[PDB]
């Protein structure tokens, strides 16, 4: 199959400035007829993809002239001369020269903003949950930027990976930050066999992880 590699996978942009997204194919997508059936689609959350550009550089009807495509052979670019709010979404390049038809993995256009360290909160299990025999320890890592973050749970100083579930918000429309929840779920019995619970967040905004913890035998 022709693998379609898009770069970057996430492209922070400021409104009004230009954005370029690259799509490279693992082989030439010049068809035998000499056309290059490289297309770009934009998908907004919850909506069908929309055709932007076909045959490398042609705008589909209704696509404003701020979108242009270029490239040849295996290297293709979609350029947006002036990003507008409505352009935020996921862009996919697509090749229709070869079967199977293949798409790139998508480049999400996101809003750039200043870096923001996460506000990290850790929560011991509620007493209610403990009564049910479960113990979820929750760590919120709120309002950070950029989106790349690594969370690590430590229980009595040892990394714990099983039972961890993370969820990430999309970029906040108000402040362009991201938030994440990380929940470590244990049985009440396992929970009660450990003392210290630590949510550790590594984010570009500090050189050292942000550490929140609590001791079960404290309050």
């Amino acid at each position: 199959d022709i693998l379609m590699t898009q770069t970057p996978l996430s492209l922070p942009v400021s409104l009004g400035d230009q954005a370029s997204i690259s799509c490279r194919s693992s082989q030439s997508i010049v068809h035998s007829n000499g056309n290059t059936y490289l297309e770009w689609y934009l998908q907004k959350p919850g909506q069908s993809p929309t055709l932007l550009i076909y045959k490398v550089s042609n705008r589909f009807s209704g696509v404003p002239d701020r979108f242009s495509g270029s490239g040849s052979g295996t290297d293709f670019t979609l350029k947006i001369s002036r990003v507008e709010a409505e352009d935020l979404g996921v862009y996919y390049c697509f090749q229709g020269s070869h079967i199977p038809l293949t798409f790139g993995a998508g480049t999400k256009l996101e809003v750039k903003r200043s870096d923001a360290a996460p506000t990290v909160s850790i929560f011991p299990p509620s007493s209610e949950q403990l009564t049910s025999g479960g113990a979820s320890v929750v760590c919120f890592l709120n309002n950070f930027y950029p989106k790349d973050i690594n969370v690590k749970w430590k229980i009595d100083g040892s990394e714990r990976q099983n039972g961890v579930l993370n969820s990430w918000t999309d970029q906040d429309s108000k402040d362009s930050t991201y938030s994440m929840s990380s929940t470590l779920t244990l049985t009440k019995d396992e929970y009660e066999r450990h003392n210290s619970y630590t949510c550790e967040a590594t984010h570009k905004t500090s050189t050292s992880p942000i550490v929140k913890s609590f001791n079960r035998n404290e309050c």
Binding site: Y41, T119, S121, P124, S136
Partner: protein
């Protein structure tokens, strides 16, 4: 009005098969191929195959999973997906294509969820700080909404009054059931002096839970 109208969302049990339709209107049905595409959540589009009368092509990856049929009389095509698993949880799109053109019109997508879960209301657990968080300008509270099915759940705080500082996280699957959390950050002034409650509604079970967040 060219339109591709797909069938509605499906919740089916593992092992079951589902038949999703894509009805075409406003153009000459036999002038276009219908292509089907999968998009798993948070991932890209994958081509499944096309269906056209006398020409059905599958992506090798889907050859054993999908069967495409076309009913030209009614200008509808179908994708049958068999022996479903949660790996098949996806939105499926149809789109049309013809020579010299591209995927210009698309169906709205059909979401498939494969689960053996029964409708289960959420357990809602208040998340109050362990009380070293009793010092900053802002306090963050949360509600853990655990063990529900199906989606969605709606979370509000103080019945929508607290709109600012709220983060409701996408649900994740944890033993066939969804878990979601929501956080709200409020001024230390306002909690615990004022009540804060997360209001969780789960329409599928007609259940609402209003959990007051009280200090531990």
């Amino acid at each position: 009005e060219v339109q591709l109208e797909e069938s509605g969302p499906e919740l089916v049990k593992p092992g079951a098969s589902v038949k999703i339709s894509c009805k075409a209107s406003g153009y000459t049905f036999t002038d276009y191929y219908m292509n089907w595409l999968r998009q798993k959540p948070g991932q890209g589009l994958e081509w499944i195959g096309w269906v056209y009368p006398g020409s059905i092509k599958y992506n090798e990856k889907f050859k054993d999973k999908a069967t495409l049929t076309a009913d030209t009389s009614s200008s509808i095509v179908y994708m049958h997906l068999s022996s479903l698993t949660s790996d098949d949880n996806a939105v499926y799109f149809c789109t049309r294509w013809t020579y010299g053109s591209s995927f210009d019109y698309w169906g709205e997508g059909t979401l498939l969820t494969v689960s053996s879960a029964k409708t289960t209301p959420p357990s809602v657990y208040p998340l109050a700080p362990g009380s070293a968080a009793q010092t900053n300008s802002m306090v963050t509270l949360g509600c853990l909404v655990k063990g529900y099915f199906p989606e969605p759940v709606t979370v509000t705080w103080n019945s929508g009054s607290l709109s600012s500082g709220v983060h409701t996280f996408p649900a994740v699957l944890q033993s066939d059931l969804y878990t979601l959390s929501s956080s709200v950050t409020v001024p230390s002034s306002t909690w615990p002096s004022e009540t804060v409650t997360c209001n969780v509604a789960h329409p599928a079970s007609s259940t609402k839970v209003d959990k007051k967040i009280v200090p531990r």
